[PDB]
Design a protein around this ligand. Structure first.
Ligand SMILES: *[C@@H]1[C@@H](O)[C@H](O)[C@H](O)[C@H](C)[C@H]1NC(C)=O
Length: 439
């Protein structure tokens, strides 16, 4: 047991109403919108295949020249009400918004820098408009914040001198000022999701990460804070040097979700996966033919997978410079919304069921102990294997959409064959189980 001043604060999962709401939401959208949407992955005639929001880095553009894109920031088609309607129709219960990305351009009129929406042709407080519009649709708003900031020369990647330590301290004050500004301007914020926190400078200032968490929690009652923010006394990130999760939930799994057999440890804490539609484009990229683009069923699979293991899932959008969404993203949102409207009782406010994974798909557990089978891979056997934990029996199976009764056959102790429906549903579908636990 290593003594730590700046390690974990929560003992197990938070169970206050704000955390329960964060968890029960389950399905979110991400918005990555900033100056990078203007070039859209192209600089000086070269299209770069790397993530579009990192174009400043790929094309080696100096800060002064990158930030002159503010002169072209004029999203004529932007309408916060339309963005919120799109999220509602998709079935998303919360939206995470890039307040400021690594480029340092702020989507709110910060009083602490000139690189903000106020100093563009458009002028308006985009962040504020979105907060209002989403909240008006009953959608929670979370703030993405990049600590790393390419626009501020006080940022340091590492601390190799007293001068660096002084400059970086000033940088951390500036960061605190922006954070407090966001928390006091937009008090309905429910979460702060940090990125750009991997550098040695931040790792050497674990105290600051703990302070930022505490500062925001005093300003915004019940706010959630992601693990990615946090480094302990030894520089260890996400989980402290004693293996304990820092912040309120684990933020990770952008590349690959937790394995449903080998990574059951994640059911012990709150967690959230965030996902791109292409392989690795968060901001707007003009050419989606450069990498694999996920289909709606592939995204739906990921969403259910997350919930089945006790986690949230957030689907990313990278709006066009004009303030509208590309057609592929409108199609995705509509497709997800259709399926969610039919089958969402197996997603919203659901959790890990504690059953052994089977090949046909995933289990999820509802708040009244409903066990939902979400079937993605239809067996030629016409039988869905259900192995129950000790003391649990399956009493009935019902097709969620129609209420039709589904045959259940016991094959051996604690194992059943659940029949597939009489008519193939032709899409991923749900069977709801009634289970009983012995005394
Ligand atoms: C951080 C940023 O570097 C990326 O551009 C993007 O904002 C994603 C969401 C985030 N990625 C990770 C691994 O933290």
């Amino acid at each position: 047991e290593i003594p730590l001043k700046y390690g974990a604060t929560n003992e197990g999962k938070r169970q206050d109403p704000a955390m329960q709401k964060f968890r029960d939401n389950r399905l979110g959208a991400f918005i990555h919108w900033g100056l990078y949407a203007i070039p859209g992955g192209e600089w000086n005639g070269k299209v770069y295949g790397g993530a579009a929001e990192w174009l400043k880095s790929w094309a080696k553009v100096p800060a002064d020249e990158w930030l002159k894109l503010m002169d072209q920031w004029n999203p004529t088609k932007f309408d916060a009400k339309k963005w919120a309607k799109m999220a509602k129709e998709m079935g998303t219960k919360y939206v995470k918004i890039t307040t400021k990305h690594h480029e340092g351009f702020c989507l709110w009129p910060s009083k602490y820098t000139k690189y903000t929406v106020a100093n563009t042709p458009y002028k308006r407080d985009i962040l504020g408009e979105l907060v209002k519009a989403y909240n008006d649709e009953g959608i929670d708003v979370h703030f993405y914040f990049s600590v790393m900031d390419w626009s501020n020369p006080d940022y340091r990647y590492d601390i190799k001198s007293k001068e660096d330590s002084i400059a970086f301290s000033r940088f951390l004050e500036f960061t605190d000022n922006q954070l407090k500004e966001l928390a006091t301007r937009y008090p309905t914020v429910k979460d702060f999701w940090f990125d750009g926190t991997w550098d040695a400078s931040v790792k050497k200032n674990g105290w600051w990460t703990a302070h930022a968490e505490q500062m925001l929690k005093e300003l915004v009652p019940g706010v959630a804070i992601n693990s990615r923010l946090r480094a302990d006394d030894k520089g260890k990130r996400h989980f402290d040097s004693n293996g304990r999760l820092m912040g309120d939930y684990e933020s990770g799994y952008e590349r690959r979700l937790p394995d449903p057999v080998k990574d059951l440890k994640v059911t012990q804490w709150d967690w959230e996966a965030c996902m791109t539609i292409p392989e690795n484009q968060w901001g707007y990229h003009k050419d989606w033919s450069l990498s694999y683009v996920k289909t709606p069923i592939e995204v739906i699979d990921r969403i259910v997978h997350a919930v089945s293991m006790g986690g949230n899932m957030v689907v990313n959008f990278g709006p066009q410079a004009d303030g509208d969404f590309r057609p592929e993203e409108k199609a995705m949102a509509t497709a997800i919304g259709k399926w969610m409207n039919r089958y969402g009782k197996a997603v919203y406010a659901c959790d890990y069921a504690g059953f052994e994974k089977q090949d046909w798909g995933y289990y999820t557990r509802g708040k009244n102990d409903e066990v939902y089978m979400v079937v993605f891979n239809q067996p030629y056997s016409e039988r869905l294997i259900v192995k129950t934990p000790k003391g649990i029996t399956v009493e009935k199976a019902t097709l969620l959409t129609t209420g039709e009764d589904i045959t259940v056959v016991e094959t051996t102790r604690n194992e059943y064959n659940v029949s597939v429906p009489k008519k193939n549903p032709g899409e991923p579908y749900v069977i709801q189980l009634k289970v009983r636990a012995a005394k």
